[PDB]
Design a protein around this ligand. Sequence first.
Ligand SMILES: Cc1ncc(COP(=O)(O)O)c(CN[C@H]2CONC2=O)c1O
Length: 364
Amino acid sequence: DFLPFSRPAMGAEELAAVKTVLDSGWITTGPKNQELEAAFCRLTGNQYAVAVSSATAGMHIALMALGIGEGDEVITPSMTWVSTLNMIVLLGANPVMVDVDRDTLMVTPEHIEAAITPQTKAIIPVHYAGAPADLDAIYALGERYGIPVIEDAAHATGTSYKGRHIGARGTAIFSFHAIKNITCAEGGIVVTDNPQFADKLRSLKFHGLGVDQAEVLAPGYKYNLPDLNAAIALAQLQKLDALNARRAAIAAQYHQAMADLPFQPLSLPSWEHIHAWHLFIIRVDEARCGITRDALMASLKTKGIGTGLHFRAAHTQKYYRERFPTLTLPDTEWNSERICSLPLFPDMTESDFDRVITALHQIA
Ligand SMILES: Cc1ncc(COP(=O)(O)O)c(CN[C@H]2CONC2=O)c1O
C-alpha cells in the first residue's frame, strides 16, 4: 500500500464542476476563469488577478511585463524551484542567487540588500512551505531602492503575514499544481494591485492580443487556463479552510512526534503569521541521526512511504553549477543536502500518519 508524500483532495465537487463545464460547451477560457480571478481578489484583498496555465507561466509573464531582459539582474534565493531561475535566464537576464535563513529556508532582508546593484530589476522572495517571508522588511527594501517585489506564493494559498493574507498588496503568484494546497492539476494565478501591470499580464498570457477587435499589440505567449481546469480550482478554493486545517492538524502530530526523534523540522518564522502547511520538511543530518537524508528517503521507500525533496538548490544543478562555478551559499547548501518532505495531504489518515512515524523510529 504505497503512501505517497502528497495526494490531491479530489471529491464529488471537482467532478460536478467539470461536468457543468463539459455540458455547457465552453471548455476553454471564459466565465470560470473570470470567477476564479474575482474569487482570488476576494480571498486576498487585492484588486486584480490574472489566471494562467501554471505558476511558472505567471512568473514568466510577470518578469516579462516588468521589461526584464539582457543586462538586468533579478535577486532570488537558490533555495526554490528551478522554474524561477529558468524564467530569469530565458528572458536574457542574470539571476543573482542569495542565501536563506538556516532554519526557515527564507530569503533574509540582509542577503537581499547586500546583492542589490543598479542593475537589480526585481526581487523574488519565496513564502517557504506555507510560512511567509519578512514582507515589511522586503517591501521597505523594494521602496527604498525602487525595485519591484514579485512574491513567489506557490506554497502559500492560505498563508497570512501579520494579520494580512499573502497577496493582499503587491504582486503574488499562486500555484494550482497537483500537490499544492488547492489544485486543478496544473494552473496558477497572478494577483496584483497595479492595473497597468494586470493589463500587460492578461495580454502576455494570450498571444499579446489586445484592443488598440483584438490584434497583436506586442508578441506574447500562450498561457491561458481552460475553464475546465478553472472550475476544479474554484471547487477546491471553496474547501480551502477545511483542507488547510487537515494539513495543520497533521503538522501538529508531526511536531509532537518529532520531540522523540532526531530529525529537525524547520523553524517557524518569528513574525506573526498563519501557516498553510504546504509541506512538512525535516532535516536529516547524518551525524545527529546516524542516517543520511538520501538513505532515509531510500529507507522510507522500502516501507512503501514516499517522500519529497524541496529543494535540491538551484545553484547545485548542472546548468547553474557550470554558469556560476564560484557561487557559494552555505545555509542553502547545508539544508539542500539534508532536507526532505514527509507525507502531508488533506486525506492522509492516522493509519498513514502513524505508519510514517513507526517507520522513522525503525530508522532512527
Ligand atoms: C516554490 C515554487 N515556485 C514555483 C513552482 C512552480 O509552480 P507551478 O507548478 O504551478 O508552475 C513550484 C512547484 N510546485 C510544487 C508542488 O510540489 N512541490 C513543488 O515544488 C514551487 O515549489
